[PDB]
Amino acid sequence: QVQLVQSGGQMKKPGESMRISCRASGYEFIDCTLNWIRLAPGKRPEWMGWLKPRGGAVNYARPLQGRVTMTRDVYSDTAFLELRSLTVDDTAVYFCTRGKNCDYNWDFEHWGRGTPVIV
Amino acid sequence: QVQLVQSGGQMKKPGESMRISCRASGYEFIDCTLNWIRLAPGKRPEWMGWLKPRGGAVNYARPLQGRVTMTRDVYSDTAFLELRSLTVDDTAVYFCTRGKNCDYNWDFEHWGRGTPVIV
Amino acid sequence: VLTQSPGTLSLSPGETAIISCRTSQYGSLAWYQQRPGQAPRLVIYSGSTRAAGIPDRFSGSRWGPDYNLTISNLESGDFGVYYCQQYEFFGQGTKVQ
Amino acid sequence: NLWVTVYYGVPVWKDAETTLFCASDATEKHNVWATHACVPTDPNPQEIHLENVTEEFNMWKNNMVEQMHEDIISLWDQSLKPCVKLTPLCVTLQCTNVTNNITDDMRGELKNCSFNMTTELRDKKQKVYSLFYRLDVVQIKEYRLINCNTSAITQACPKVSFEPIPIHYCAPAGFAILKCKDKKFNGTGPCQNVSTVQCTHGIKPVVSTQLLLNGSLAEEEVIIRSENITNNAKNILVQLNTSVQINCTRPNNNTVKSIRIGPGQAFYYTGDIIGDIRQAHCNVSKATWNETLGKVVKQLRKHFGNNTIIRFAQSSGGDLEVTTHSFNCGGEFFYCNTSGLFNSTWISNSNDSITLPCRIKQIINMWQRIGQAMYAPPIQGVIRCVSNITGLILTRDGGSTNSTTETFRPGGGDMRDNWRSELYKYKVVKIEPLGVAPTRCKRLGFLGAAGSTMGAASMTLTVQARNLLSGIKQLQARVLAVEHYLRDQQLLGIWGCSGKLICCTNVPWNSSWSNRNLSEIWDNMTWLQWDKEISNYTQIIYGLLEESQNQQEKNEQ
Numbered sequence: 001q002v003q004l005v006q007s008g009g010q011m012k013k014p015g016e017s018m019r020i021s022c023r024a025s026g027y028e029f030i031d032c033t034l035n036w037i038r039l040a041p042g043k044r045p046e047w048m049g050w051l052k053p054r055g056g057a058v059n060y061a062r063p064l065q066g067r068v069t070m071t072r073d074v075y076s077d078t079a080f081l082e083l084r085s086l087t088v089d090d091t092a093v094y095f096c097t098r099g100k101n102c103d104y105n106w107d108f109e110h111w112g113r114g115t116p117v118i119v
Numbered sequence: 120q121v122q123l124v125q126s127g128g129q130m131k132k133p134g135e136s137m138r139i140s141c142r143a144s145g146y147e148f149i150d151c152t153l154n155w156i157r158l159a160p161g162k163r164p165e166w167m168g169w170l171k172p173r174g175g176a177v178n179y180a181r182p183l184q185g186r187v188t189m190t191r192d193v194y195s196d197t198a199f200l201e202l203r204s205l206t207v208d209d210t211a212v213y214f215c216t217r218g219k220n221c222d223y224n225w226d227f228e229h230w231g232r233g234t235p236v237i238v
Numbered sequence: 239v240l241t242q243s244p245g246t247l248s249l250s251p252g253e254t255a256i257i258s259c260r261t262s263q264y265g266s267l268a269w270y271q272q273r274p275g276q277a278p279r280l281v282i283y284s285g286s287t288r289a290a291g292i293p294d295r296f297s298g299s300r301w302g303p304d305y306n307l308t309i310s311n312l313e314s315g316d317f318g319v320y321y322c323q324q325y326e327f328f329g330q331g332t333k334v335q
Numbered sequence: 336n337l338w339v340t341v342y343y344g345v346p347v348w349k350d351a352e353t354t355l356f357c358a359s360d361a362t363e364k365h366n367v368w369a370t371h372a373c374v375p376t377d378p379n380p381q382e383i384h385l386e387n388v389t390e391e392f393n394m395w396k397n398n399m400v401e402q403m404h405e406d407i408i409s410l411w412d413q414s415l416k417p418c419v420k421l422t423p424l425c426v427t428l429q430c431t432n433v434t435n436n437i438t439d440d441m442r443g444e445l446k447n448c449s450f451n452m453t454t455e456l457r458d459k460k461q462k463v464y465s466l467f468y469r470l471d472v473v474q475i476k477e478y479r480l481i482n483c484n485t486s487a488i489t490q491a492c493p494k495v496s497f498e499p500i501p502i503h504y505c506a507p508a509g510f511a512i513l514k515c516k517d518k519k520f521n522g523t524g525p526c527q528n529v530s531t532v533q534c535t536h537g538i539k540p541v542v543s544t545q546l547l548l549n550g551s552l553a554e555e556e557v558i559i560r561s562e563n564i565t566n567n568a569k570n571i572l573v574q575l576n577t578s579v580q581i582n583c584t585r586p587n588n589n590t591v592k593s594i595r596i597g598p599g600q601a602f603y604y605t606g607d608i609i610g611d612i613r614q615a616h617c618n619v620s621k622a623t624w625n626e627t628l629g630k631v632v633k634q635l636r637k638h639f640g641n642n643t644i645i646r647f648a649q650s651s652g653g654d655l656e657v658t659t660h661s662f663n664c665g666g667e668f669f670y671c672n673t674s675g676l677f678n679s680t681w682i683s684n685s686n687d688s689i690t691l692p693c694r695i696k697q698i699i700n701m702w703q704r705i706g707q708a709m710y711a712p713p714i715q716g717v718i719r720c721v722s723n724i725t726g727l728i729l730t731r732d733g734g735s736t737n738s739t740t741e742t743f744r745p746g747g748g749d750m751r752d753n754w755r756s757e758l759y760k761y762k763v764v765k766i767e768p769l770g771v772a773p774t775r776c777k778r779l780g781f782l783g784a785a786g787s788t789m790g791a792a793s794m795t796l797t798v799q800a801r802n803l804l805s806g807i808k809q810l811q812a813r814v815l816a817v818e819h820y821l822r823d824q825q826l827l828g829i830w831g832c833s834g835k836l837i838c839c840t841n842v843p844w845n846s847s848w849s850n851r852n853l854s855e856i857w858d859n860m861t862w863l864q865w866d867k868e869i870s871n872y873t874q875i876i877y878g879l880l881e882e883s884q885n886q887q888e889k890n891e892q
């Protein structure tokens with residue numbers, strides 16, 4: 001059973017940064033891509049990026065380039081999402097996800113509990 | 120060449136305890152059951168017990184239950200026979216033995232030199 | 239459990255010794271030779287199989303729940319105390335002289 | 336007249352031992368009793384009842400038990416190979432009793448031990464406070480870990496769990512596993528309901544020493560299996576009819592702390608207990624256990640006199656693995672005092688539980704080996720296990736004079752007994768595809784029709800032959816399968832039979848070779864009975880086949 005456990009219940013003011021810790025278990029962390037997705041109410045979910053936590057390669061969404069950093073602790077099996085320059089439009093539940101198969105990143109069968117963030 | 124070397128020639132008074140060591144060589148100590156036999160002169164000889172040194176499992180003769188204890192070391196391949204509450208009927212030559220084929224312990228091909236005990 | 243007979247055998251060298259041992263149990267019966275001052279080395283096991291190092295003068299044969307050890311041409315190295323064992327139980331012993 | 340005919344693929348086998356391969360159900364299950372050399376298994380693709388086959392089994396003389404002993408030890412050692420060695424932990428411990436802030440003496444048999452230990456850096460040391468069990472330390476106050484002076488203690492990797500998983504042992508090419516389906520089968524002698532399987536039903540390596548946990552149950556009644564019962568040394572393996580539920584617990588939070596003791600080497604230890612210091616224990620259902628002992632003594636009275644007295648008693652002695660019931664529970668190793676169970680006397684004619692005190696060890700010298708020991712890291716939280724007692728290992732006190740009463744105690748000290756109680760119904764056999772039979776020609780799945788008569792069983796030879804040719808020891812087994820195949824094909828080639836499968840040749844049949852006027856040979860006898868009847872003559876028949884083919888080839892060519 002794959003499980004992603006996310007911290008949350010954070011509230012931030014505009015101009016501050018936020019950091020979300022996603023601890024992964026039930027699969028080999030190193031060998032499978034994790035994604036961060038922004039699910040705001042009302043508007044379409046915005047996929048924020050992917051992290052391949054072996055080399056640490058990242059891909060940040062174009063509108064979020066320069067604002068989002070993703071890192072990993074490969075020894076604690078934990079992915080981290082850092083979002084900077086927060087505004088009121090960043091209110092959303094942030095999710096840590098994994099694809100169904102590690103061959104195909106975007107079949108997100110495994111979602112975390114969610115990280116509500118209100119700005 | 121399988122050999123059992125016993126320390127003996129011990130004299131004890133009734134009520135005293137005794138310990139007889141048996142150092143074994145020529146075979147894997149762990150893998151073969153070792154037996155302690157009491158050859159009382161002029162009386163039917165009695166097999167005191169068997170000791171499976173791998174786990175140290177032990178089986179004492181019913182007439183001796185509560186008075187005979189057997190222990191061992193497996194880093195120095197030594198078995199120990201310990202008796203308490205000795206009486207005059209415990210005078211005997213005590214032997215440490217091993218079977219011809221460890222699958223059957225009872226046919227005792229290898230005997231120690233013999234440890235007389237006078238009580 | 240098992241009764242060995244006779245208690246003593248008076249025999250000169252060259253005679254054949256028959257040592258009987260009756261038992262009320264089904265088990266392999268072994269025979270042990272206790273030379274005075276020495277350990278009771280195994281003579282036979284399984285009721286008829288010789289232990290390594292034992293001359294071919296030692297044998298066993300009988301029918302039913304009874305065993306007999308036949309020792310032909312007794313030498314000066316024999317005439318010890320003979321014991322029968324079945325499954326941890328030992329006969330009272332026969333002294334061969 | 337009668338002539339030798341060679342049949343390749345006859346359903347004939349011998350009691351030959353070999354190396355079986357691992358099969359298991361297909362992340363977290365790859366860190367539990369696994370080497371990653373165990374192939375994915377199939378959902379029981381083949382189980383073929385061998386109708387009219389009677390086979391002789393001996394559960395105490397087979398190489399499946401010895402193979403499990405070797406394979407489980409290797410599996411254990413590989414699980415512990417890429418893990419932290421605790422040589423840095425073999426240090427002098429300054430241990431005091433765990434304190435309650437009062438005058439009460441040691442509770443829980445725990446010792447609070449302050450030691451200086453190595454750190455990630457070699458130039459610095461970290462003082463560590465760890466709650467070790469009394470059974471893990473020896474006084475030298477100053478203490479040392481019990482196995483530091485005799486063995487190299489290896490810490491289990493924290494990701495590795497000791498929960499048992501089913502392991503299926505499978506026949507290599509050229510071999511079959513036979514299963515005994517007889518109900519009440521006592522593991523020895525003839526078996527009437529015999530089947531051919533590629534693999535076992537899945538044997539869980541459930542480590543236990545006195546009671547058999549999470550095993551198979553007897554089909555109709557308690558089965559007491561011993562090579563011989565009157566022999567004390569031969570342990571008595573009791574397979575129960577209906578299990579006895581045993582609820583085991585470690586009622587201590589055992590807050591786990593960890594330190595670095597070297598580059599990449601994390602040592603896990605118990606830091607504190609937030610609640611009261613409580614003894615680990617197991618609850619065996621009292622009514623169920625008493626009924627179970629009733630059934631066991633009824634079966635022993637069937638083995639002994641019907642008017643005898645059967646007394647149960649605590650283990651007579653030995654190490655903790657023998658004197659107590661050892662087992663894994665949730666990652667901790669329990670050593671339960673079974674004197675609360677083996678203490679009744681049964682004389683031939685309430686919802687309460689029997690609580691067995693259990694001691695917990697962290698340094699486990701499993702299989703009582705020389706130079707090896709494992710340190711089980713503590714598990715965070717209160718441990719609960721509900722296990723099924725499906726059997727017992729018993730011994731009987733010897734020196735039984737006044738034989739009206741017999742005394743039985745729990746056994747242990749030889750882990751192979753746990754596997755015997757699971758492998759009691761299995762044996763490994765080598766296929767002998769070359770058979771000879773008298774004929775006048777003078778020129779279903781695997782092992783199906785093995786119990787059929789010959790002739791009828793000679794029309795399935797290709798089904799039998801198709802199951803041939805299907806780390807170091809496994810590759811040697813594969814090469815042996817290839818060499819045996821090639822020796823049979825080479826021998827057929829010498830006979831001029833390599834491509835015929837049924838080869839009629841010019842060798843007269845000798846009437847001394849159980850002639851039986853042919854009608855019995857083909858209408859009454861099976862291939863197994865026939866091979867047994869001429870097992871002392873096949874070398875002569877083979878030599879005559881070689882001579883005849885050589886003479887015919889030289890005369891014709």
Ligand SMILES: *[C@@H]1O[C@H](CO)[C@@H](O[C@@H]2O[C@H](CO)[C@@H](O[C@@H]3O[C@H](CO[C@H]4O[C@H](CO[C@H]5O[C@H](CO)[C@@H](O)[C@H](O)[C@@H]5O)[C@@H](O)[C@H](O)[C@@H]4O[C@H]4O[C@H](CO)[C@@H](O)[C@H](O)[C@@H]4O)[C@@H](O)[C@H](O[C@H]4O[C@H](CO)[C@@H](O)[C@H](O)[C@@H]4O)[C@@H]3O)[C@H](O)[C@H]2NC(C)=O)[C@H](O)[C@H]1NC(C)=O
Pocket residue numbers: 263264265266284285286298299300301302303304305306562563564565
């Ligand atoms: C634990 O392990 C032990 C040993 O490891 C097992 O013991 C064996 O038990 C089996 C069966 O349980 C025994 O087989 C039976 O043996 C019967 C007797 O065999 C001995 O005697 C006969 C001749 O005896 C005849 O004459 C006697 C007159 O005194 C009379 O009392 C008797 O009834 C017979 O009429 C010999 O031919 C045979 O070789 C054997 O010899 C004994 O004595 C010699 C002494 O030199 C010794 O070497 C041998 O080892 C043995 O002690 C036998 O009658 C019985 O036959 C049955 O089947 C036939 C079928 O034709 C049937 O006609 C007959 O009525 C019976 O039903 C069968 O062969 C075996 O002998 C035991 N072996 C040993 C070594 O003790 C034990 O069973 C096992 N226990 C458990 C619980 O697993």
Ligand SMILES: *[C@@H]1O[C@H](CO)[C@@H](O[C@@H]2O[C@H](CO)[C@@H](O[C@@H]3O[C@H](CO[C@H]4O[C@H](CO)[C@@H](O)[C@H](O)[C@@H]4O)[C@@H](O)[C@H](O[C@H]4O[C@H](CO)[C@@H](O)[C@H](O)[C@@H]4O)[C@@H]3O)[C@H](O)[C@H]2NC(C)=O)[C@H](O)[C@H]1NC(C)=O
Pocket residue numbers: 363496497498499541542548549662663664665666719720721722723
């Ligand atoms: C005989 O057989 C019984 C039954 O199989 C065994 O008892 C089981 O033992 C296992 C291992 O100790 C237990 O599994 C553990 O359960 C814990 C509780 O899980 C609860 O929640 C899950 C949610 O899915 C449920 O499935 C489950 O039923 C419970 O409600 C878990 O927390 C444990 O996981 C922890 O450890 C593992 C590694 O061991 C890690 O992978 C996890 O991340 C986590 O840290 C674990 O899964 C099982 O619950 C027991 N069942 C019963 C009925 O008792 C006996 O142990 C076995 N006998 C012997 C001697 O081995």
Ligand SMILES: *[C@@H]1O[C@H](CO)[C@@H](O[C@@H]2O[C@H](CO)[C@@H](O)[C@H](O)[C@H]2NC(C)=O)[C@H](O)[C@H]1NC(C)=O
Pocket residue numbers: 432433434447448449464466607608
């Ligand atoms: C084990 O011993 C250590 C010290 O030997 C104890 O740790 C101290 O506990 C007291 C409790 O009042 C604290 O005030 C100290 O600050 C602690 N010292 C250190 C260095 O940690 C520990 O509590 C003991 N644990 C048990 C269970 O007895």
Ligand SMILES: *[C@@H]1O[C@H](CO)[C@@H](O[C@@H]2O[C@H](CO)[C@@H](O)[C@H](O)[C@H]2NC(C)=O)[C@H](O)[C@H]1NC(C)=O
Pocket residue numbers: 192194195473481484485
């Ligand atoms: C390793 O250490 C153990 C424990 O010190 C030794 O075993 C015996 O343990 C008991 C425990 O009560 C002591 O009373 C004995 O004195 C110990 N014997 C000896 C000879 O020290 C064990 O023998 C040691 N191993 C080796 C190879 O010396």
Ligand SMILES: *[C@@H]1O[C@H](CO)[C@@H](O[C@@H]2O[C@H](CO)[C@@H](O)[C@H](O)[C@H]2NC(C)=O)[C@H](O)[C@H]1NC(C)=O
Pocket residue numbers: 649658659672673674675
């Ligand atoms: C298991 O518990 C029993 C008690 O149920 C222990 O037996 C006691 O052993 C001591 C040894 O000195 C005796 O003095 C007591 O009289 C025994 N008690 C009873 C009630 O008979 C036994 O030693 C324990 N065994 C293990 C392995 O822990």
Ligand SMILES: *[C@@H]1O[C@H](CO)[C@@H](O)[C@H](O)[C@H]1NC(C)=O
Pocket residue numbers: 431432440441
């Ligand atoms: C610890 O408890 C044991 C219990 O046997 C006692 O003998 C010992 O003296 C106690 N030690 C301390 C330091 O309290």
Ligand SMILES: *[C@@H]1O[C@H](CO)[C@@H](O)[C@H](O)[C@H]1NC(C)=O
Pocket residue numbers: 427428429449450451
């Ligand atoms: C740890 O080392 C110090 C010296 O650095 C010593 O005084 C102290 O007693 C040691 N403590 C233990 C528990 O070994």
Ligand SMILES: *[C@@H]1O[C@H](CO)[C@@H](O)[C@H](O)[C@H]1NC(C)=O
Pocket residue numbers: 516517518527528
């Ligand atoms: C074999 O299986 C059949 C199935 O009908 C059963 O009747 C028979 O009793 C079984 N044999 C044994 C020895 O249990």
Ligand SMILES: *[C@@H]1O[C@H](CO)[C@@H](O)[C@H](O)[C@H]1NC(C)=O
Pocket residue numbers: 519520521523524562
């Ligand atoms: C029990 O085993 C003995 C041999 O030890 C055998 O003769 C007997 O038939 C077996 N009992 C059953 C019910 O299969």
Ligand SMILES: *[C@@H]1O[C@H](CO)[C@@H](O)[C@H](O)[C@H]1NC(C)=O
Pocket residue numbers: 549550578722723
């Ligand atoms: C224990 O026995 C019960 C009997 O109903 C069974 O349902 C359960 O699956 C068994 N558990 C194990 C682990 O064998």
Ligand SMILES: *[C@@H]1O[C@H](CO)[C@@H](O)[C@H](O)[C@H]1NC(C)=O
Pocket residue numbers: 555556557576577630
């Ligand atoms: C075996 O267990 C069943 C319940 O599964 C029970 O009815 C039967 O009586 C038990 N056998 C004996 C011999 O008590």
Ligand SMILES: *[C@@H]1O[C@H](CO)[C@@H](O)[C@H](O)[C@H]1NC(C)=O
Pocket residue numbers: 588590609716717
């Ligand atoms: C064990 O201690 C931890 C400390 O965080 C606590 O959260 C947990 O609930 C405790 N467990 C029990 C069973 O009380």
Ligand SMILES: *[C@@H]1O[C@H](CO)[C@@H](O)[C@H](O)[C@H]1NC(C)=O
Pocket residue numbers: 580581582618619620688721
């Ligand atoms: C064991 O615990 C279960 C709950 O996990 C309970 O239903 C069962 O009755 C308990 N058994 C015993 C023998 O205490």
Ligand SMILES: *[C@@H]1O[C@H](CO)[C@@H](O)[C@H](O)[C@H]1NC(C)=O
Pocket residue numbers: 625626629679680
């Ligand atoms: C319970 O155990 C006692 C032990 O003395 C026994 O006498 C009684 O008959 C048993 N009751 C059963 C199996 O119902």
Ligand SMILES: *[C@@H]1O[C@H](CO)[C@@H](O)[C@H](O)[C@H]1NC(C)=O
Pocket residue numbers: 386387784786787788
């Ligand atoms: C077993 O023998 C019976 C005897 O009637 C026969 O009918 C049956 O076909 C035989 N089994 C096989 C597999 O040939």
Ligand SMILES: *[C@@H]1O[C@H](CO)[C@@H](O)[C@H](O)[C@H]1NC(C)=O
Pocket residue numbers: 843844845846847
């Ligand atoms: C048959 O066996 C007898 C045994 O004496 C032997 O003399 C004869 O040559 C054999 N015949 C054949 C054809 O093998």
